[PDB]
Design a protein around this ligand. Structure first.
Ligand SMILES: O=C1c2c(ccc(O)c2O)CN1Cc1ccc(F)c(Cl)c1
Ligand SMILES: O=C1c2c(ccc(O)c2O)CN1Cc1ccc(F)c(Cl)c1
Ligand SMILES: [Mg+2]
Ligand SMILES: [Mg+2]
Ligand SMILES: [Mg+2]
Ligand SMILES: [Mg+2]
Ligand SMILES: [Zn+2]
Ligand SMILES: [Zn+2]
Lengths: 368, 184, 368, 184
DNA sequence: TGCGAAATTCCATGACA
DNA sequence: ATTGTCATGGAATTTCGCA
DNA sequence: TGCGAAATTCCATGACA
DNA sequence: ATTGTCATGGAATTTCGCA
């Protein structure tokens, strides 16, 4: 503080204060003639308070804060002190937006077999049709084969009703879903254990994680819409049609329809493919096993020029889910316990719990 | 002539009436001719209406070229005929009193009747709930003649629920005495 | 139809049917042995119906439709006929998404003088504070200097109340706004004509067009949020503080605060810049005129690799604004009357009116 | 010594009571010392409270270094003093009975009084509405001494509303007879 | 006439519901 | 008849202090 | 052994509220 | 304790029919 600054006025060299400028006194304050003009050099014991007053005016970031201070003051390495404050400002940390993108998405391997993995989800509410408001959508991961069930609510009870009917055909190893109330109930848990089905859940608020079914929801809504153009939105009676329509539609990239990947042979639907008419069912099933394994699989896209990837013990913040008006968009900083993969992490959270979250719902805390 | 495939022919038939279960009285039985895969639908009656309602569910998963049946009322109605024509499903009838299917089908249908009987004793009223587990059983049952179960022929893969302890399927001493006593 | 196909069976060459394949008869239909297998060659008079039946199964696009047809048929230039149908399918045209991006944004010139252009807009509803729910935000285009007025509704009546108070300071040439009810009322129209103010409106549903004020709304909400962290959201009393705070905050790219660009001198606020203490007001105002004209102006970004730009007489479709559940996202095709600029157009619309719309709210009709 | 700038000094004073207009009785007058720019705020009383309410509006646009006033009650209260100290605004008083401003200010204040009088005749009750047009007038008025209007000195640009027909500002024969008759 | 470190500038990211 | 914008904080780049 | 045109594949865009 | 996806229709590229 006054030690350093005394030492200075009497021409002696101090580290950080370049020698070529001269450092006088005036109005009882140490000043200096800098190219921009004369600036006060406050004692070190004053600088925290100053940086703070300047920052607090509009809770500004690095440069906008610096520019206010530089109006009156100069001292060695001002931005260091500015950044020190930014990193300690609770209000800035939990309100500002990130300016670093998530790392590139994972393209998880396609389930190996039909019934290996289901992705399930609800669509709705929709215009009431026969007193029904939602649709249970079940999509086989490997094939894309899709089942539709109209429900009155996105409830556990209705999910179980529909899934008992579906699983008469086959029981799946795993059922992946978002954390919707219907799927996270302990009744649904029992229902699954009862059948040796493993329940898999997306990280929270990250529907990309159910992308398989989500994407299929789009096709379902799109096709329903075209079918209802200029009629009252009476969709109940079309679910069966939409189901059959989509299960028998070609994926231009795969060159197969989910029905083909599921059965290896078209059923009696229009335009049925006849290419294996001469093979025995076994030769047919053998060609199907081949087709199945050799399907196009996309790869991780290039990282954007300014992505971040999570690192164990890093300070990161989870996005507030449904933030009230005028309230922060971010939770308080927390620590990365475990890097499950480059897009998924476990963090020790805002209260004191473990949470598995998508990198998409986090920002790295700025200024360390 | 071309080899036999799934969806070539669906054999359908009713079973019932059975004791009321959650409102239902009958079972529509569909069996795929090639694979022996079995679908079951509970109905309140053996009518064209109940048949169409049920077959609408199935035919929104796969459509057979041919449906085969006895000359049951429900299947001979011109409503049912109209329904099938609408879907380019050819209909096919065995002559009255003389029902012919196929060996595989006959035997399947036999298993279906027996296995049902075995479970609607002690709980003759609770079968509605059991129709799914019945189907999985039937469909993961090894076919002596073919190397494979119907699940395997249909989908071309093993099943996550194999039925390893292929069962008695015969009435144990206690069930005989309480089936010859339930029908009292 | 049968003419061409007769002509063909008897070995003679027809244009479109390559000579090296042989074209037999069977089951009363012309067939051909193609590498993939034997395909029926329907008569031309049948092909429209076929393409249609195939397309209608799931209202599929080009390849997925082709693949169904190719299952049974072959003929010359199948995709041409497929595309012909797609372009005529009302339901596909108004329901499908575009897959062509808008052309690169315009960076309009910064207004030359304070008061040349205002951008105005409402924020809210907000948590009730003293019975107030909205905020009128007025932003000077040239300077960014911003006025805030708390209102009970985003109404014309309140807009006029606030703007009478503001325009005691100066009257602006032009006031740009979105098409909100408050600004499009004929009362507001009168109010403006009464004062020789020109009313300028954004194209509809395109808030980027009011980007100046929109962007400032963000800063306002952001700063209010930080100031209200852990207190009840009592924002009424902070408007004045937020106003003063932001009007005196540096834009790091400009190196000026809206207050400086408005007055050329800081008022008695914390950290006031003192650099022109020795100039006369006139020398000061002279330096201000210089600062004003030489401010950084960004340029149009590179077009994305798959943008489209509107062309007079092109068929384009306006986005349905607030589309009901299960209804098309697009209006029927319409024609580009006039290209106002590369991002703005006039179209002859879905009924029979002229409309000025942003390119962002249009897709080019596919298949011509 | 450094040249004079805007925001260096604000001269404030009350005018009233006037005839009720939309509930209001007084006008707080703020004039910038350097520029002669004028702000006007309608109040219901000449109190510290009404002064603070009004000055809060203005001081959220710009803050003067010094406010100058007569020793009006409202300005000498320690509430008003606290208010100014809170904003690092130094307060400054002319000695009682002997009010000193500056030539520019004196003359401005004079125009303000006259121009008001000129419009609150015929409509002595409708002035509240007119305060904005009054200000624009005052602020786009050419200063004989300086080459510029206060708008131009404040903002450094021409105004979109220049007041080209600088007015009589004097009471025409009809107004004399109905002002010496309104105060009847 | 060139070094190491500070200062500045650049700029992608995201939010204005 | 009209049109995106700009605070932000790491990284990239330039400038500075000294020689 | 190379041309013009058709067929195929590529792939950015946008929506799953 | 987990993870984006894929129909779409112009453009880019490969293949085809003929020589
Ligand atoms: O389908 C849902 C859904 C949402 C929230 C909560 C749920 O439980 C949901 O099912 C939002 N959403 C649509 C959506 C939005 C953005 C995307 F990237 C994808 Cl893939 C899907
Ligand atoms: O501020 C408004 C607003 C909206 C609809 C209708 C109005 O009248 C509005 O004022 C949506 N919106 C926020 C918004 C969203 C996306 C953007 F790119 C920008 Cl710039 C701003
Ligand atoms: Mg969901
Ligand atoms: Mg969903
Ligand atoms: Mg608006
Ligand atoms: Mg807005
Ligand atoms: Zn802060
Ligand atoms: Zn269509």
């Amino acid at each position: 503080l006054d030690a350093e600054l005394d030492q200075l006025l009497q021409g002696h060299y101090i580290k950080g204060y370049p020698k070529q400028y001269t450092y006088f006194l005036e109005d009882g304050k140490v000043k200096v003639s800098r190219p921009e003009g004369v600036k006060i050099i406050p004692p070190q014991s004053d600088r925290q308070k100053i940086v703070l007053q300047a920052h607090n005016l509009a809770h500004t970031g690095r440069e906008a804060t610096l520019l206010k201070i530089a109006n009156l003051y100069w001292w060695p390495n001002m931005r260091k002190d500015v950044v020190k404050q930014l990193g300690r400002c609770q209000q800035c940390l939990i309100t500002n937006a990130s300016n670093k993108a998530s790392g590139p998405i994972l393209r998880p391997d396609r389930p190996q077999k039909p019934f290996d993995k289901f992705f399930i989800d609800y669509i709705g509410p929709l215009p009431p049709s026969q007193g029904y408001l939602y649709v249970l959508v079940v999509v086989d991961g490997m094939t894309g084969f899709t089942w539709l069930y109209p429900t009155k609510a996105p409830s556990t009870s209705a999910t179980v009703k529909s899934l008992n009917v579906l699983t008469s055909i086959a029981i799946p190893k795993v059922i992946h879903s978002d954390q919707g109330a219907a799927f996270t109930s302990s009744t649904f848990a029992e229902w699954a254990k009862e059948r040796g089905i493993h329940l898999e859940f997306s990280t929270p608020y990250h529907p990309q994680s159910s992308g398989k079914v989500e994407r299929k929801n789009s096709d379902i809504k799109r096709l329903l819409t075209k079918l209802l153009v200029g009629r009252p939105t009476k969709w109940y009676d079309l679910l069966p049609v939409v189901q059959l329509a989509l299960n028998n539609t070609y994926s231009p990239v795969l060159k197969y329809t989910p029905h083909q990947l599921l059965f290896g042979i078209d059923s009696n639907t229009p335009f049925a493919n006849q290419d294996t008419l001469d093979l025995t069912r076994e030769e047919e099933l053998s060609l199907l096993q081949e087709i199945r394994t050799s399907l196009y699989h996309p790869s991780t896209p290039p990282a954007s020029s300014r992505s971040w990837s999570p690192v164990v013990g890093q300070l990161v913040q989870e996005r507030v889910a449904r933030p009230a008006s005028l309230r922060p968009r971010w939770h308080k900083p927390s620590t990365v316990l475990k890097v499950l993969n480059p897009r998924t992490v476990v963090i020790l959270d805002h209260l004191g719990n473990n949470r598995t979250v998508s990198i998409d719902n986090l920002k790295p805390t700025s200024h360390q | 002539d071309r080899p036999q495939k799934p969806f070539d022919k669906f054999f359908i038939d009713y079973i019932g009436p059975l004791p009321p279960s959650q409102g239902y009285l009958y079972v529509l039985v569909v069996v795929d001719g090639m694979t022996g895969f079995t679908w079951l639908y509970p109905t309140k009656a053996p009518s064209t209406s109940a048949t169409v309602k049920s077959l609408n569910v199935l035919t929104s998963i796969a459509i057979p070229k041919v449906i085969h049946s006895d000359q049951g009322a429900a299947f001979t109605s011109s409503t049912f005929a109209e329904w099938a024509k609408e879907r380019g499903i050819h209909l096919e009838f065995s002559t009255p009193y003389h029902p012919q299917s196929s060996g595989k089908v006959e035997r399947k249908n036999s298993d279906i009747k027996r296995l049902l009987t075995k479970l609607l004793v002690g709980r003759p009223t609770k079968w509605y709930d059991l129709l799914p587990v019945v189907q999985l059983a039937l469909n993961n049952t090894y076919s002596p003649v073919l190397k494979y179960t119907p699940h395997q022929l249909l989908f071309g893969i093993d099943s996550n629920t194999p039925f390893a302890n292929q069962d008695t399927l015969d009435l144990t001493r206690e069930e005989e005495l309480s089936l010859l006593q339930e029908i009292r």
